[PDB]
Amino acid sequence: PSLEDLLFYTIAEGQEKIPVHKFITALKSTGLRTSDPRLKECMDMLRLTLQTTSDGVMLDKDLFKKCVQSNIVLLTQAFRRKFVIPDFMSFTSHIDELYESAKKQSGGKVADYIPQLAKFSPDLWGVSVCTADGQRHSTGDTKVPFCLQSCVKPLKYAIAVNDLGTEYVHRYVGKEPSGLRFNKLFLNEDDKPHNPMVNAGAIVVTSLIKQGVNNAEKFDYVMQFLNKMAGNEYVGFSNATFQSERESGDRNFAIGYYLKEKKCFPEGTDMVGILDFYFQLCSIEVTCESASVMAATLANGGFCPITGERVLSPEAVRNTLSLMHSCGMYDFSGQFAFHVGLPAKSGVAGGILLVVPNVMGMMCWSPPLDKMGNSVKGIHFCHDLVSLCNFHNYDNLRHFAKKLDPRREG
Amino acid sequence: PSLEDLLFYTIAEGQEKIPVHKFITALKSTGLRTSDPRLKECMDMLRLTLQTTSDGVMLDKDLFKKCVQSNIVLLTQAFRRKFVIPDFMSFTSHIDELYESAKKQSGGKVADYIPQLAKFSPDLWGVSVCTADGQRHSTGDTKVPFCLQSCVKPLKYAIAVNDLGTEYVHRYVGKEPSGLRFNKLFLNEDDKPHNPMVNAGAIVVTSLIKQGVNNAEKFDYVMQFLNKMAGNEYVGFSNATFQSERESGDRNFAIGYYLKEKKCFPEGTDMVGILDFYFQLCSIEVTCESASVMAATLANGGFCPITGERVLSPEAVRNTLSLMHSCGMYDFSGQFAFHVGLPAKSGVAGGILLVVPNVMGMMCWSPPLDKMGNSVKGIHFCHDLVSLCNFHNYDNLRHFAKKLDPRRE
Amino acid sequence: PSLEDLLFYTIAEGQEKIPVHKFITALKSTGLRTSDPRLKECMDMLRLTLQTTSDGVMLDKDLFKKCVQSNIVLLTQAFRRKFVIPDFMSFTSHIDELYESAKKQSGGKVADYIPQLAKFSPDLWGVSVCTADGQRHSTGDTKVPFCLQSCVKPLKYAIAVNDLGTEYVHRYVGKEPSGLRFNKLFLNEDDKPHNPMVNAGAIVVTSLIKQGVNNAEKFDYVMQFLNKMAGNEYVGFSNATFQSERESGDRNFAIGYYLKEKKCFPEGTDMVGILDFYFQLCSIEVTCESASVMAATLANGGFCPITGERVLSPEAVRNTLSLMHSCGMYDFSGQFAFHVGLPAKSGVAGGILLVVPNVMGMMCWSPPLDKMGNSVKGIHFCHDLVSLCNFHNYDNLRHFAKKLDPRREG
Amino acid sequence: PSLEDLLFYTIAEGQEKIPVHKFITALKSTGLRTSDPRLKECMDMLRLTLQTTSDGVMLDKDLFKKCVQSNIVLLTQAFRRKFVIPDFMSFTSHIDELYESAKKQSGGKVADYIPQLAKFSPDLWGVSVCTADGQRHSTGDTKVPFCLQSCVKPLKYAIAVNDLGTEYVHRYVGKEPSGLRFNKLFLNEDDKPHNPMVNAGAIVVTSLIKQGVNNAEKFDYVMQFLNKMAGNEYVGFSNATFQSERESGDRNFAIGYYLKEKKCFPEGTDMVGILDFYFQLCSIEVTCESASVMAATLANGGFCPITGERVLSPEAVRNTLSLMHSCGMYDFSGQFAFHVGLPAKSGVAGGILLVVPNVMGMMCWSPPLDKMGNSVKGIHFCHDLVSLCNFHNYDNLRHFAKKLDPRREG
Ligand SMILES: O=C(Cc1ccccc1)Nc1ccc(OC2CCN(c3ccc(NC(=O)Cc4ccccc4)nn3)CC2)nn1
Numbered sequence A, C, D: 001p002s003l004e005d006l007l008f009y010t011i012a013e014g015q016e017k018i019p020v021h022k023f024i025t026a027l028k029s030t031g032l033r034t035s036d037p038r039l040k041e042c043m044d045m046l047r048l049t050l051q052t053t054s055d056g057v058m059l060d061k062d063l064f065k066k067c068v069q070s071n072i073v074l075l076t077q078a079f080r081r082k083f084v085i086p087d088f089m090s091f092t093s094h095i096d097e098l099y100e101s102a103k104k105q106s107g108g109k110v111a112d113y114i115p116q117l118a119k120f121s122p123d124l125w126g127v128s129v130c131t132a133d134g135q136r137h138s139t140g141d142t143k144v145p146f147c148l149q150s151c152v153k154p155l156k157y158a159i160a161v162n163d164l165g166t167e168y169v170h171r172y173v174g175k176e177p178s179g180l181r182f183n184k185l186f187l188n189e190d191d192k193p194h195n196p197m198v199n200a201g202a203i204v205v206t207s208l209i210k211q212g213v214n215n216a217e218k219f220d221y222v223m224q225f226l227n228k229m230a231g232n233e234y235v236g237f238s239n240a241t242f243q244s245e246r247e248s249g250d251r252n253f254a255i256g257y258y259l260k261e262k263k264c265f266p267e268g269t270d271m272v273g274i275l276d277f278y279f280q281l282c283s284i285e286v287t288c289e290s291a292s293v294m295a296a297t298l299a300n301g302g303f304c305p306i307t308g309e310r311v312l313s314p315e316a317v318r319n320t321l322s323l324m325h326s327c328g329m330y331d332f333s334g335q336f337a338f339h340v341g342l343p344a345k346s347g348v349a350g351g352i353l354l355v356v357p358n359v360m361g362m363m364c365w366s367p368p369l370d371k372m373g374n375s376v377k378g379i380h381f382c383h384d385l386v387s388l389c390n391f392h393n394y395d396n397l398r399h400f401a402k403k404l405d406p407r408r409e410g
Numbered sequence B: 001p002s003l004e005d006l007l008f009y010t011i012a013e014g015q016e017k018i019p020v021h022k023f024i025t026a027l028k029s030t031g032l033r034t035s036d037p038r039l040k041e042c043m044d045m046l047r048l049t050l051q052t053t054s055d056g057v058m059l060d061k062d063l064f065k066k067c068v069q070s071n072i073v074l075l076t077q078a079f080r081r082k083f084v085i086p087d088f089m090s091f092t093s094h095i096d097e098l099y100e101s102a103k104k105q106s107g108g109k110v111a112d113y114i115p116q117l118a119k120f121s122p123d124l125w126g127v128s129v130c131t132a133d134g135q136r137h138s139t140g141d142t143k144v145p146f147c148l149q150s151c152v153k154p155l156k157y158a159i160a161v162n163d164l165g166t167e168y169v170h171r172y173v174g175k176e177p178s179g180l181r182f183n184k185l186f187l188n189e190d191d192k193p194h195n196p197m198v199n200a201g202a203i204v205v206t207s208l209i210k211q212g213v214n215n216a217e218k219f220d221y222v223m224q225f226l227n228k229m230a231g232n233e234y235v236g237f238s239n240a241t242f243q244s245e246r247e248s249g250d251r252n253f254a255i256g257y258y259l260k261e262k263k264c265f266p267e268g269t270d271m272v273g274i275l276d277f278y279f280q281l282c283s284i285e286v287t288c289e290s291a292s293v294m295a296a297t298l299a300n301g302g303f304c305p306i307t308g309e310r311v312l313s314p315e316a317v318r319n320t321l322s323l324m325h326s327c328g329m330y331d332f333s334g335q336f337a338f339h340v341g342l343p344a345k346s347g348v349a350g351g352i353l354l355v356v357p358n359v360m361g362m363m364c365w366s367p368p369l370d371k372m373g374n375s376v377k378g379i380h381f382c383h384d385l386v387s388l389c390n391f392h393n394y395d396n397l398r399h400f401a402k403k404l405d406p407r408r409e
């Protein structure tokens, strides 16, 4: 027997030469992208076989074997429908309808409190999917960068817990929602911020990461970390957003000074610098595509699905998902957890980083916010998404009424 | 080919008659109990053959077909190791270790406010498991009756959502935790109680069930419902607990009048009557075994796992799970969601109704409570359980470090 | 010399027979009424000389002396302008302007939550004065009975402190305002109600009065007490108001059960019976005239000004004045204390029991209540009054700008 | 007749020359000090008579006329026992007893949060009286400087109202106590600090005074203002306290930024500069003697009692008294208003600026603070004072049980 030969016969279809475009089309049908880093040896070898000839361009079993040998494990599970979403082409047409249905919710106000969130057009709308297996799909404005803002809060929390542990991190930050009563209070009863997802909590978490080095290396290290989280897809920085966030962060300076007075920072913290680092971390830029890979890493137990690298420890991902569940959508967190039941995190730029554990990661983006700070189209999409699929954290995998389950084929 | 014959040969062992004590043993190893109602026809005929030919005791291949005939589907997935927990015998050895480690946590105080909770011994400790497929295991005092107390709140909420729908029910009760800053406040910003898991919310929920009949029919309507959730195992009533709760419920009488003044009940509500109904639902009794089937029904999308009956709509079960996750353990709820990450519900009798979605339901019971009202041993068990198995809501099924996965081989 | 004849010469005209109508008209100018209980022997004697032989309304120096003998001390300070308000006739003319200008504040809604207060016309508006010296003046509907409702709370608080002492009473009730929006929190940090002026505090206070006898004797004791406080003017009971307060007091029953569970009552308290006593105390009836004497006792250190009796201990009156200052006007207490600076207490029937310490007590009554529960006309009047006179608690008696001081002469 | 001649005979003692040492003793017994600025012409002339005529220290009627001529009015009310406290020598014996009674309360902790309050000895203890007529008495450490700290908050508020009016000032700051559940909150329901006596309210009030000039001119404008309140007695500045107060004020910097974000300052406010001004106003130094004249100015309707100057408008003084009544002693204000019933204001240095309206001003000073921030000895003295005299806001001036009234004779 031989696995490269088996794969060849199921794609060759009784024929005895496979055109290269027919293998690439079959490959995209799985949902993988030709630029998937795990396929680079096979793509490199197709580029090198495509130097021998403009004439022919077809692959027999040993030229097919010559190329796919290196990636045969990953290619066969794609072609034997063993990915988390077997009929991925069906699923993306459901993603497309959902996207078109939110695209009609043109309500909401674009954030204007700094001129950089204000440049953004209110009709921009993108959705990007990445599954725990690296199947990819985008629809809308998924390759235009925008700032993470508070979507960076779960990421730096994950980094902090990954490096220092749950017990150290939560000496300085709570792990509960504050209650739809104390959005205005900075501290709880043990004089810690309520959770890493609020501004007081995020600011303390920022003070914990890579202590003892300067802000340039702290920022470089986090940029490093989000690079592995996004499988090296687009991660950037908006100094324009950075400069406006700092000439307007009077609430954040208030929080910083309060926390300094309540001794909420580690010993030896230069608070005003932490606020500068914090403003930098919220001006980091992503696209829907690159952010959905960050989301997919959290959906995949800490392994980036398009590279296979272990990026976060399982304790760090669990905590971050646990706190995205309950504190992730500002004053909407309770309603979102009840009706949508997915770990999610909103930001004022209009992104909603969304995680379906064991299935997929996503980044929705539309700048118009609702009265609570969450993207109107984004919020609409997540209700529709869970209304269509048994993706709700407490849906049942066996008895789920008339909803659809993309993890299965029949 | 044929399914009874294959199953025969995989148990027949190359040999050509199967002793029934060996068939009964292979069966119990899967985790089913021979008294599973889904198995009653196969058991009834095994008893009839042990009568019709009392000479002999062994089963040839066509007498085997005569017995496993109508339950062959369930028997095959039991014997082909296809239940949610394939190696049930190993897993119960883990449950036993977990129980013995929680059994040495002797802290906590038994509830004193009525002499019925105080007469319970502090050495009582039991955990009962029931899977989404009906595999059962017990350890400790799992056949001792006790009242559900607030463990009844997620059930009556589920009954309410099942009968009237999410939107109607939550016209009268919120869907969030209050914030552990407001056990003291009864109402949220829209003058509804914060959620069904606090006393004020349960009292409003109690007022929604079976409107228009008297308390005797409402109670029996709830009783029919809880019988079905537990596959007809023990569901009872303590009038002793009921009478003491009503002569000491000055706080719930306080809540009732407040809700009446703030107009939180549906029109035409007899507030004091609802309060009497509420004290009754909190005096309903279960054992660990019978309640664990109720928990397993919630883990099973609303189908009772030992009968196959649809008891609750999936909307009802999902809502109830979401609110047990966040509001189920009084002031320990946030910590419980973070560290244990399981839908659970505490009661003052010392029970913790616990649900691992898609796997199993459980009921742990130990009367000594901690400072927050949660059973000391029960809480210790739930931390151990999640530290051992990847059952945490946001554990990963593919990458889970040093944890054990009982769903895997 | 002689004090009765000196008095005679001061009314005597330079002439030396005084007509009896001239003495009585000169008497009323003082602000005293001929039916003042301290004047009864002098009136009894005028009733008897007015028998003599009806010829000549005149009193010679020996017949005048025969009548004014027994009350000569009180009559001499009345006629030698030694009362707290010397020119009382001028002062009532300002009361009349203040009354007529408030009479045009037609805003507000009559309480209708029971049909007995809803029965009252918004037409009704009365003001009654009684000074620390027994000078009386009314304007408007001052002889119509209405219920005290929460205006009774300072009075039963005074009775409690008079009988048991400050220390015992305040084991069960706080002595501060709650903070203006804690009206439905029932207890403070020490699990006592915030003060006697809120429903929870009043309910605890009711449980403290005359412990150990039944509600009929408890009520008879408070009624006798309010009789001595009003110099035996009208005090009654509206059973109509009583039954509607009790078949509608769901908030008061909620409060009672809450207090029972938190063990806020003295040992051996029958909770639902106390609530019945409390509903009775709020159904006690007064008129403006009768109630202004009760207020005047409070302005007078606990001595009723029209009888001379010690009715309340000074400790009881001081505390009651202290808490009417801060807690007397519901959510208006802070604004009322700041701008008006007088101890006052409102009730839902439209009353405002008002005390000017060392000067006079008042009862304003107009049923239409404002958005906060206080009588519109009454509130308008209390501002005008303090805007006209240096009666504000922190006005200065020596340097007081544009304001008038009715205690001075020229 | 003639007023200089009358006064001579009541002192002339039956003789026809008054020894000057005897006139000075008769004067001091009234409670005036010979250096009273209102007495300067009489003292300058006695000193000059003591130079021109060494030949016998005796004063006849024509030379006694020569000295008391210019200050004749004030001298007569001093000697004809018309000052607010006629038997001033008796009363000071009561102040001394009260002082020695609190001197035995050696509990409490001296504030150490900056090294300047930490070096004050714990049994420094002084009380200084100044009446509405300028009668003075001190006992203990009454001439040692200390900073006002929050004792400056009522003075700046009075200056703000004096210059800008009630309506303007209270556009930016409330006028009620917060409630012993909102001591931690910075803002009320209308996004203003609760009252001028808490730090957020003091900080906004500081931002209102003398807008448009720099901090040097602002500072001199307030000092010049506090100089008149103290009859030009010692008002100074501790730069040491100022430098340590600005390097420890992260809580007030927290307050500043929060108020900036919630826009609680006038337009064009330099917040960080206002904070510097705020740190200066609390480092202003006084003694018990000089501060008690400031208190006496508020007790005297805005006139400094030892000079005759109008320093504050009556509206300014009334408001400031109303808000020290209810908001002046941190979390102790309600208990203090209830039991002591006097306008007072506490500071972390151990001062309590105390005002008995229409009678006298006081400053008590003892550095050891109790749990709530109030000077242990100061608070004990203030209870003692009101248990001894009927100065309580709602004591009665006519019926006051066994208490003493220093306004009366015997
Ligand atoms: O341990 C605790 C808390 C706690 C909770 C539970 C048990 C015990 C202890 N520390 C703690 C936390 C937060 C906090 O607050 C600070 C101060 C400023 N800051 C404001 C400041 C004004 C406001 N103002 C309003 O809410 C106005 C308003 C009031 C009422 C109705 C409507 C509006 N909000 N936040 C936010 C930070 N202080 N201390």
Ligand SMILES: O=C(Cc1ccccc1)Nc1ccc(OC2CCN(c3ccc(NC(=O)Cc4ccccc4)nn3)CC2)nn1
Pocket (backbone or CB within 6 Å): A181, B184, B185, B186, B187, B188, B189, B191, C184, C185, C186, C187, C188, C189, C190, C191, C258
């Ligand atoms: O010693 C304490 C606490 C304490 C002490 C020391 C240190 C920390 C704590 N006592 C105490 C007193 C009263 C009290 O409350 C009771 C029960 C419910 N009860 C409601 C219930 C809901 C409402 N409604 C709302 O809150 C809605 C709302 C919420 C927010 C903003 C706007 C509206 N009102 N009253 C009336 C009375 N609990 N505990």
